[PDB]
Design a protein around this ligand. Structure first.
Ligand SMILES: O=c1ccn([C@@H]2O[C@H](COP(=O)(O)NP(=O)(O)OP(=O)(O)O)[C@@H](O)[C@H]2O)c(=O)[nH]1
Ligand SMILES: [Mg+2]
Length: 1715
RNA sequence: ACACAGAGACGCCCAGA
RNA sequence: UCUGGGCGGUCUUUGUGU
């Protein structure tokens, strides 16, 4: 309506004013809604408006009741345009036209109505519209708009004299209209009615997928616009880029894009590599001349024997050549005493039994003469501290004793220069000969007494564990849990676990003593709390060695562990003593975790051999061998020890190689080099050599049975005993029992510097093979441009075929959106960033200063403080800094892995911002690839599974499948970082090239810090005498005696030009490997088409690729016996030619690859053996004890639950899950101070009073469904069935026990460097909308940063390695010194008494309101709890080798945000919105539309707690392994292997029974929640005028929108009065196209639909669908298959079962009715 | 004792003889 | 080379992705 009257009524007097916000609610009565007929075209959406329904209150003058139309591009403002079009005047002007330019960057955006004709003013009446149901969101919108538009106007005020400006804001919502210019109630009513009718139009229009998936709002368009503006105005100064980085000319990119691939070179090179591969495969694999398989195997065995003997001779020639040595693998005594109690006759016989005897006697004399206090803590003294709220001796050791101790490292620094110490040091470096006699290790492994019963079931430690386990099982006390508990007791009464108990106690007590220091000659003596073993301890410091000597009376040792693998013990008169041994912080974790490790090992290797936990059987040879091997690996904890058994997987996968090809296990002799320093290493190496000889002698026998393919003849990697396939795969994985987190000494940092340099120094001198020309015999780091063009074109063809034509525009828009939506804060994280700069280059200046890495969060917050809020506004500054620097800065360390040796690089702050854009670009490009899995996880378990279906469909029954599991070597340093730029720039638009090329061109000069301490100890070592050229290379490179290109005179860095870094260009290299795999796929299809005699071989080829590990799968069908051999030969040639085709692409095939394997593939350690999927369970079983350093006590339990779930999903039965949860309980209580605190039993007794998990109680899963339910499920069960619910209800009615680690010394400092305000809580409270959205301004980003830094995740992120020793070192004072915090400092005994004195003031239970508030998922918890009583006793039968994968399965966050702030986040319409909000109000009565009303009248003081509450309100799904009512089936099948415990038609019958019985609520919602589909209806009801039509109406238009099989089915329908036909069809999920088509046709024929009329649309399309049949997407005719609430009458028909779902016309549609 | 085809660690900072 | 004392979320130490 009129604007001049609205403008002229205001009068400006002095200057700029904001006005007064007037709020006008609904005052006058409102009519209904006019009749609206909306139709969506291919170019616009148009509305016909009917008569206004009886405007008795003069409301509706603005509407015209005629015809209106809008565009698709203008549709997203369908409210903001149509509501406000009466006041809209076409101006297209900015204030910059009427005000002089102040150069503030505000000269381009039109700010809505800016009517100027009032005495020379500008008003800028700027407009808005919201869906808020309250005032708080309206106030937030007003504040956001005024903050957006206030500052530039005030900046532009002062340019002219006497300003007259008067800015204003209008906001319209359903609840009312708030403004600031003078407005009367009538036009406010008009605007609100226009808003209601426009919202109705928008609701009708939201049944169109062109608008549902349209751009959300102006935020996405503005992000795309700013990204476009940055990308079109970014000058990287390319001449400088060429001047400072090598190989940075644009001409490489121009010639790659312009000059096509030379077909003649490709044709010549392919036949050259084909004949080379044929010659190599004949020569190496013995085909010329012709021979049988047997003699081929014998001569391959001869080659293997010769190669192993050559390696043995080479290792023996560099050793000390000794065939006998007395060395113990386990350096701990074999004592297994009987612990009784605290027990602190010729004490002179120890003096003359050596130096250790002298020390022990002169210590025990001080013990007897001195004070008992100090050795152990008195219970009374510790109890006197909690309620009321170390022994050191200096013996005069002799010179001989001091020298003997210094020989073993005790005070060895002072006696370094003596002759004996120097001789010991010289002999220490000697390598052991491989021919050393190690028969004792094999004798111990084969025969031992580790699993024999120890008979201490009535022991106090076992009594404590038993009572705690009985209390944990008291709430579930049935027969099955009792049987498995008794089995755990038997596993706790073995000899090995009883030895491990006192060993773990010693390790934990050493970890406690690691923080103590002693003077020269002082020692610390203690007694084990249970066992009568005395420990003498020499502490140096925490980061150095701890020394210990053990002593025990000869009468207290009841029995010993058999075997000669133990170190010699000194035999004195009445005591047995052990020499001084050393440990470190890293080595203690394995010894702490020892009894749990043995318990889990016994459980796993007991069930894997087929004996039940509840059966009694004597241990066999192989079980003892596996347990002893695990014991020795855990006790030794050395990298070279586990490397040999790690390589056994790659060695033993070669036994699956099919003819014609021989097994090649002797290719791994290259990685088996290196010195051997222990007897166990020698034994493992010889067993590995024997395994290679046995593998080369005979392959694994692949037997085709009646319905499945099986493998026989498989055997253990080390012990060599014949076992099953699963046992072999698991035995490949015993080497991960070593700790990941191994502290690396400085002397090992040099050798890991080799891999950076040893491949850099061989850079080719000519860069004309680095991307310029073509080469048929390429050196490493070189590649062919033509081959890269061919592979890139092949992947381009694949992407265009899969995602339709003009896909580059979609890729451009998604890349622009992804870049624009990124802010500064998302890249801020608690990951380490480098601090290396130009000031750190010269060692002559940084010799004293020590280098510390900073946090990325701190630097990103520093950039936030400087007024940088968007990501694109920092990349330019980062590139300016990097280009001025001239190089990219990197700092290194070592990865704490198991698979080998690996260096890890860390960027500075500048390079990360540049790398992030390229990373997102490459990820978005790889998302289009149909065989890339790094960005598409769903393809990991899809391509392998669907290959069988494709082979069955295309080739039919009887298909031979041949696989190749390729792995690349040196994936990072091999790729010269010009290939990746070319590959990325092939797929990207033309205007994005000049940033992609630059950002990747900075990887060609890498500037890497080396360790400063390494430089300090190398500077004073200018003379080197090592038998390795790299050591002297480092020495004279640092000292400048020679010239190298990778280190200069006195520089703290190394230069690296060739190669990328690890994972830094992960997605781009994934794209490159996808291109290579696509080229190989096309080439393989071509060769299978051209045949071998000219007759084609009918076969299917598909490839999968990740980062460097790929797999090629080829299924072929021979037609005869003679054809099969030739076809297998041809396929073997094709799969072998990749090893020579890869160097043309610069990829080097490793010896880790297993080529030409039938019915077997490995991709990501996921071994697919035909229809039997194999996972290594031992990795997750060994992963069940590393926990994160957390502050709350229950968080330890939830971490244990997470690790337990990880162990369950790896393929473990529920019995192992229960047993390893028992071991987790034991581990948690030992960390609580079970073996280090005198006051545990009383603590134990106090847990009689209260089983509170927050106070230190461990909850246990139900043994039938253990691991699959979280910790919160156990908490819920305990609250319902025990008295814990009373305590929780009392605590809630009154208104958790958490401990600070280091009292937040670092955290607070991390706060103080940021400078964040301490008053941010009220700023969050006053604008509730700062969350639930992303960001809009600098202040809200700062507030979100302050919210991020005050989070549990960032709190539990400053923890360092060796978490278990640091946790257990606090176990001596966790109970009896004030360390916990309650919701000041108080000991946990005090917390238990405070809980106990309030236990008398307890009553009732948890009402439904509190348990719904606290325990949000209670419904499915009860549903899964009520499905467990059907099987409760050990009743069943023994009847598994068919293990496959199985899976077991609006929300309030969107609802609250939409209601309170009007942000579109829900699919549901207004009716369902009101219904869901009413249900949420029924859930919590304190909720209200006003945010302030909910804040003030709620239990949360500020909005952040409310936000975390809503986040915690909002599904748990678990993946298992087993054979192919579902819950009952998987529980019955997955309890124990081979043992049973006592479209889907069945689901359709269940739904029908529910419909006839009406057990639940709406049957439509029950069907939808059951994942069945077929729910929806019309939105244009096919307008019906008169009967003469074909069904009265059925003419003109019509759309059916609904959900079937989780899709957005939006079938367009149209009739001409004589027939009805579909027009366009849209689908969301393309999982099962054929079943969806069948269901669609079945729905269609019930109403009557013809597909004769094809279409009128020839645009973008993925599949074109003719009549009831799939056709090619663009051939002819068809229709464009496109990928992007009331129940009144369910009557039935006759003679057929029917469900009347008649939506808007007299025809019945069927859901699942049928006959 | 740990690390290593001999680079390290086996204590480190403080005023006093 | 001795004398007194002080020393822990110490440092080493943890990157790119899923
Ligand atoms: O922790 C990791 C592990 C793997 N990766 C990335 O994944 C790649 C493959 O991981 P990889 O174990 O195969 N190492 P690679 O350099 O290929 O040599 P090799 O072990 O002999 O085959 C590596 O080259 C890294 O780029 C990481 O970035 N971080
Ligand atoms: Mg690899």
């Amino acid at each position: 309506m009129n604007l001049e009257v609205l403008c002229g009524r205001i009068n400006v007097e002095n200057g700029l004013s904001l006005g007064e916000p007037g709020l006008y609610d609904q005052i006058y009565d409102r009519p209904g809604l006019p009749d609206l007929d909306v139709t969506v075209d291919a170019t616009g959406v148009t509305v016909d408006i009917g008569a206004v329904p009886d405007s008795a209150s003069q409301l509706g003058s603005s509407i015209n009741a005629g015809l209106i139309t809008i565009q698709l591009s203008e549709a997203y403002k369908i409210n903001h345009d149509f509501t406000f079009s009466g006041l809209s005047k076409t101006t297209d002007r900015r204030l910059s036209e009427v005000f002089p330019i102040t150069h503030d960057g505000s000269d381009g955006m039109t700010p809505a109505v800016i009517h100027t004709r009032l005495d020379g003013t500008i008003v800028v009446v700027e407009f808005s519209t919201t869906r808020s149901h309250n005032i708080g969101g309206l106030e937030a919108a007003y504040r956001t708009k005024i903050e957006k538009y206030r500052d530039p106007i005030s900046r532009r005020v002062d340019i002219m004299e006497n300003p007259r400006v008067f800015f204003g804001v209008i906001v319209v919502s359903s609840g009312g209209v708030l403004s600031n210019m003078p407005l009367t109630q009538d036009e406010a009513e008009e605007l609100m009615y226009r808003f209601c009718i426009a919202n109705e139009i928008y609701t009708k229009a939201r049944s169109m997928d062109a608008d549902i998936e349209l751009q959300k709002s102006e935020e996405e368009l503005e992000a795309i616009s700013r990204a476009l503006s940055f990308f079109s105005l970014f000058e990287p100064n390319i001449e400088r880029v060429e001047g400072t980085f090598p190989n940075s000319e644009i001409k490489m990119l121009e010639q790659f894009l312009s000059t096509p691939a030379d077909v003649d070179f490709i044709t010549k090179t392919l036949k050259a590599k084909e004949v080379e591969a044929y010659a190599d495969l004949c020569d190496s694999h013995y085909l010329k001349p012709e021979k049988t398989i047997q003699e081929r195997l014998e001569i391959n065995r001869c080659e293997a024997i010769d190669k192993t003997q050559d390696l043995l001779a080479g290792l023996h020639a560099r050793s000390n050549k000794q065939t006998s040595l007395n060395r113990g693998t386990v350096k701990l005594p074999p004592w297994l005493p009987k612990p009784s109690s605290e027990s602190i006759s010729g004490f002179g016989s120890l003096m003359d039994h050596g130096a250790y005897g002298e020390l022990w006697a002169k210590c025990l004399l001080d013990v007897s003469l001195g004070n008992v206090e100090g050795v152990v803590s008195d219970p009374a003294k510790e109890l006197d501290i909690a309620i009321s709220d170390y022994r050191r001796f200096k013996p005069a050791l002799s010179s001989s004793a001091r020298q003997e101790f210094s020989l073993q490292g005790v005070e060895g620094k002072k006696w370094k220069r003596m002759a004996a110490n120097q001789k010991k040091e010289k002999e220490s470096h000697e390598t052991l000969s491989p021919f050393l006699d190690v028969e004792d290790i094999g004798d111990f492994l084969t025969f031992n007494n580790l699993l024999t019963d120890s008979r201490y079931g009535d022991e106090s430690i076992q009594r404590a564990v038993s009572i705690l386990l009985e209390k944990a099982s008291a709430m579930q006390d049935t027969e099955l849990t009792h049987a498995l508990n008794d089995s755990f007791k038997r596993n706790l009464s073995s000899n090995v676990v009883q030895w491990s108990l006192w060993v773990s106690c010693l390790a934990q007590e050493l970890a406690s003593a690691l923080k103590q220091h002693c003077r020269a000659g002082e020692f610390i003596i203690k007694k084990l709390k249970f066992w009568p073993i005395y420990v003498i301890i020499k502490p140096t410091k925490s980061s150095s060695h701890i020394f210990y000597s053990l002593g025990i009376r000869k009468a207290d040792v009841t029995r010993r562990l058999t075997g000669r693998v133990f170190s010699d013990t000194i035999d004195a008169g009445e005591w047995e003593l052990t020499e001084f041994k050393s440990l470190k912080t890293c080595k203690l974790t394995n010894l702490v975790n020892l009894p749990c490790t043995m318990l889990n090992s016994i459980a796993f290797w007991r069930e894997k051999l087929g004996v039940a936990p509840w059966l009694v059987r004597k241990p066999c040879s192989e079980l003892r061998e596996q347990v002893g091997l695990t014991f020795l690996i855990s006790l030794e904890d050395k990298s070279k020890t586990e490397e040999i058994i790690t390589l056994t997987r790659y060695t033993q996968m070669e036994g699956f190689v099919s003819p014609p090809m021989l097994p090649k296990p002797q290719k791994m002799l290259g990685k088996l080099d290196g010195p051997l320093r222990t007897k166990l290493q020698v034994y493992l190496l010889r067993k590995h050599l024997d395994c290679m000889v046995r593998i080369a002698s005979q392959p694994f026998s692949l037997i085709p049975r009646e319905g499945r393919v099986e493998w026989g003849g498989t055997f253990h990697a080390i012990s060599g005993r014949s076992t099953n396939l699963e046992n072999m795969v698991n035995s490949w994985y015993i080497g991960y029992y070593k700790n990941k987190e191994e502290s690396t000494e400085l002397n090992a940092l040099g050798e890991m510097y080799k891999k950076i340099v040893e491949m850099e120094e061989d850079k080719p001198s000519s860069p004309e093979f680095l991307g310029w020309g073509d080469t048929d015999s390429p050196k490493k780091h070189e590649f062919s441009r033509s081959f890269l063009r061919a592979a890139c074109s092949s992947l381009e063809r694949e992407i265009a075929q899969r995602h339709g034509r003009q896909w580059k525009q979609n890729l451009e828009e998604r890349v622009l959106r992804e870049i624009g939506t990124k802010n500064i804060l998302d890249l801020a994280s608690m990951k380490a960033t480098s601090n290396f700069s130009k000031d750190w280059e010269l060692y002559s200046e940084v010799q004293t200063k020590e280098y510390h890495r900073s946090k990325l969060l701190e630097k990103m917050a520093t950039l936030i403080e400087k007024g940088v809020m968007w990501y694109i506004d920092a990349v330019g500054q980062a590139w300016k800094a990097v280009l001025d620097d001239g190089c990219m800065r990197i700092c290194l360390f070592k990865k704490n892995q198991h698979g080998g040796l690996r260096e890890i690089y860390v960027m500075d702050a500048n390079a990360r911002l540049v790398q992030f854009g390229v990373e997102t670009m490459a990820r978005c490009v790889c998302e289009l690839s149909p065989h890339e899995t790094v960005a598409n996880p769903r393809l990991k378990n899809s391509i392998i599974e669907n290959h069988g279906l494709k082979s069955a469909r295309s080739l039919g029954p009887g298909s031979i499948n041949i696989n190749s599991s390729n792995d690349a070597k040196k994936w990072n340093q091999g790729h010269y970082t010009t290939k990746l730029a070319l590959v990325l720039c092939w797929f990207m638009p033309a205007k994005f090239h000049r940033f992609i090329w630059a950002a990747i061109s900075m990887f060609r000069r890498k500037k890497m810090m080396v360790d400063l301490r390494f430089l300090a100890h190398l500077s004073s070592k200018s003379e080197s005498r090592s038998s390795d050229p790299f050591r002297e290379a480092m020495t004279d490179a640092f000292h400048g005696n020679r010239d190298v290109s990778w280190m200069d005179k006195g520089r703290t860095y190394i230069k690296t030009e060739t190669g990328m870094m690890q994972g830094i260009l992960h997605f781009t290299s994934s794209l490159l490997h996808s291109c290579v795999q696509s080229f190989y796929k096309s080439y393989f299809v071509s060769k299978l088409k051209e045949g071998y005699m000219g007759e084609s071989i009918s076969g299917v080829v598909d490839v999968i690729e990740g980062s460097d590990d790929s797999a090629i799968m080829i299924s072929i069908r021979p037609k005869s016996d003679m054809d099969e051999v030739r076809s297998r030969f041809f396929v073997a040639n094709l799969l072998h030619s990749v090893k020579f085709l890869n160097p043309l692409f610069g990829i080097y095939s490793s010896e880790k690859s297993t080529v030409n394997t039938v019915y077997c593939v490995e991709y990501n350690s996921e071994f697919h053996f035909h229809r039997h999927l194999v996972r290594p369970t031992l990795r997750w079983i060994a992963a069940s004890h590393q926990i994160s350093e957390t502050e709350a006590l229950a968080s330890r339990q939830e971490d244990y639950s997470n690790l337990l779930t990880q162990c369950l999903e790896g393929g473990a039965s529920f019995s192992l899950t229960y047993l390893i949860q028992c071991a987790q309980l034991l581990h948690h209580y030992m960390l609580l101070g079970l073996c280090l605190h005198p006051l545990f039993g009383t603590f134990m007794g106090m847990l009689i009073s209260d089983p509170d998990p927050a106070l230190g109680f461990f909850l246990m899963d139900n043994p039938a469904f253990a691991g699959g339910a979280g910790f919160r499920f156990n908490l819920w069960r305990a609250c319902k069935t025990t008295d814990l619910g009373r305590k929780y209800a009392y605590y809630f009615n009154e208104i958790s026990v958490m401990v600070y680690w280091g009292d937040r010394k670092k955290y607070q400092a991390l706060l103080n460097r940021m400078g964040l305000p301490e008053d941010w809580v009220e700023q969050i409270d006053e604008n509730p909308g700062v969350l639930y959205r992303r960001a809009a301004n600098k202040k809200e980003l700062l507030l979100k940063l302050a919210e991020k830094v005050h989070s549990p995740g960032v709190t539990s992120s400053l923890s360092k390695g060796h978490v278990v020793p640091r946790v257990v070192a606090a176990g001596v004072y966790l109970l009896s010194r004030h360390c916990f915090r309650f919701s000041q400092k108080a000991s946990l005994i005090k917390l238990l008494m405070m809980s106990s004195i309030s236990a008398m003031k307890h009553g009732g239970s948890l009402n439904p309101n509190q348990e719904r508030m606290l325990f949000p998922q209670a419904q499915e918890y009860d549903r899964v709890c009520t499905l467990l009583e059907e099987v409760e006793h050990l009743t069943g039968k023994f009847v598994e080798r068919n293990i496959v994968r199985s899976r077991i399965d609006c929300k309030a966050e969107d609802l609250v945000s939409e209601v309170w702030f009007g942000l579109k986040r829900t699919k549901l319409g207004p009716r369902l919105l009101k219904e869901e909000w009413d249900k949420l109000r029924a859930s919590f009565a304190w909720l209200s539309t006003d945010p302030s009303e909910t804040l003030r009248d709620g239990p949360f003081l500020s909005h952040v707690q409310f936000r975390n509450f809503i986040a915690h309100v909002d599904s748990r799904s678990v993946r298992l392994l087993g054979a192919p009512t579902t819950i009952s089936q998987v529980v019955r099948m997955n309890f124990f292997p081979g043992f049973s415990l006592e479209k889907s038609r069945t689901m359709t019958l269940c739904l029908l029974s529910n419909y006839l019985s009406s057990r639940g609520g709406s049957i439509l919602d029950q069907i939808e929640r059951a994942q069945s589909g077929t729910l929806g209806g019309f939105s244009k009801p096919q307008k019906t005028f008169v009967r003469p039509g074909g069904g009265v109406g059925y003419k003109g238009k019509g759309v059916w929108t609904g959900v079937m099989e989780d899709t957005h089915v939006q079938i367009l329908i149209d009739g001409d009065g004589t027939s009805n036909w579909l027009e366009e069809i849209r689908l969301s999920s393309d999982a099962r196209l054929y079943d969806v088509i069948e269901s669609i046709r079945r729905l269609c024929d019930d109403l009557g639909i013809n597909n004769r009329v094809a279409s009128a649309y020839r645009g973008h399309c993925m599949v074109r669908l003719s009549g009831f049949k799939i056709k090619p997407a663009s051939r002819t005719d068809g229709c464009p298959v496109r990928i992007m609430p009331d129940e009144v009458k369910m009557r039935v028909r006759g003679d057929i079962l029917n469900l009347s779902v008649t939506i808007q016309e007299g025809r019945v549609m069927n859901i699942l009715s049928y006959r």
